[PDB]
């Protein structure tokens, strides 16, 4: 290394690790060879979907008068958003609980 290094994530403009994503694509046996544009695309998607679920969980935390995200706020985030509930349609979150819901015909009047 004659010049100064800069992480591939820094060229791409990402927080997620492009190098690790490339080593995982290589060593996962997904294909014979991995093109240099695939890790940066995949890292940007994982970062985006991570930002979505955390944004909604930080809203759910603030609205529950708390400052630390806990499994409850990830469940409340995922089950209220129409697309994230569809993506995570057959996943369970440990310590998540259930989304508050009562059928109207059970109510006391």
């Amino acid at each position: 290394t004659r010049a100064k290094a800069k992480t591939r994530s820094s060229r791409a403009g990402l927080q997620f690790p492009v190098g690790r994503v490339h080593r995982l694509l290589r060593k996962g046996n997904y294909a014979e060879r991995v093109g240099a544009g695939a890790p940066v695309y995949l890292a940007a998607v994982l970062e985006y979907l991570t930002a979505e679920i955390l944004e909604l969980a930080g809203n759910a935390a603030r609205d529950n008068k708390k400052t630390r995200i806990i499994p409850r706020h990830l469940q409340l985030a995922v089950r209220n958003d129409e697309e994230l509930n569809k993506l995570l349609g057959r996943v369970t979150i440990a310590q998540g609980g259930v989304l508050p819901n009562i059928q109207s015909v059970l109510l006391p009047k």
Binding site: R8, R33, L42, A51
Partner: protein
């Protein structure tokens, strides 16, 4: 004792951009790490089948883009494809 890798520092870096005043518990962090591992395998596994059907041996941005369009619901897919296209464009022009 021996090193175990996880996404936890990158999950924390993203959290501190979108809600800078909040934090995340150790049980929430292992859910977030599990989600990233699952979505990585779901995208890469479909990209693997797409390359194979077309007799290609290389995964490229076209295979990842198509796997994202297949795996994600409609409104997430438009954004995820836009963020991926922006990252490939910034990377290639900054390289």
């Amino acid at each position: 004792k021996t090193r175990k890798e996880s996404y936890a520092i990158y999950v924390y870096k993203v959290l501190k951009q979108v809600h800078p005043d909040t934090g995340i518990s150790s049980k929430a962090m292992s859910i977030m790490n599990s989600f990233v591992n699952d979505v990585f395998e779901r995208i890469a596994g479909e990209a693997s089948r797409l390359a194979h059907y077309n007799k290609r041996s290389t995964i490229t941005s076209r295979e990842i883009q198509t796997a994202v369009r297949l795996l994600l619901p409609g409104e997430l897919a438009k954004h995820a494809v836009s963020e991926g296209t922006k990252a490939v464009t910034k990377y290639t022009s900054a390289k």
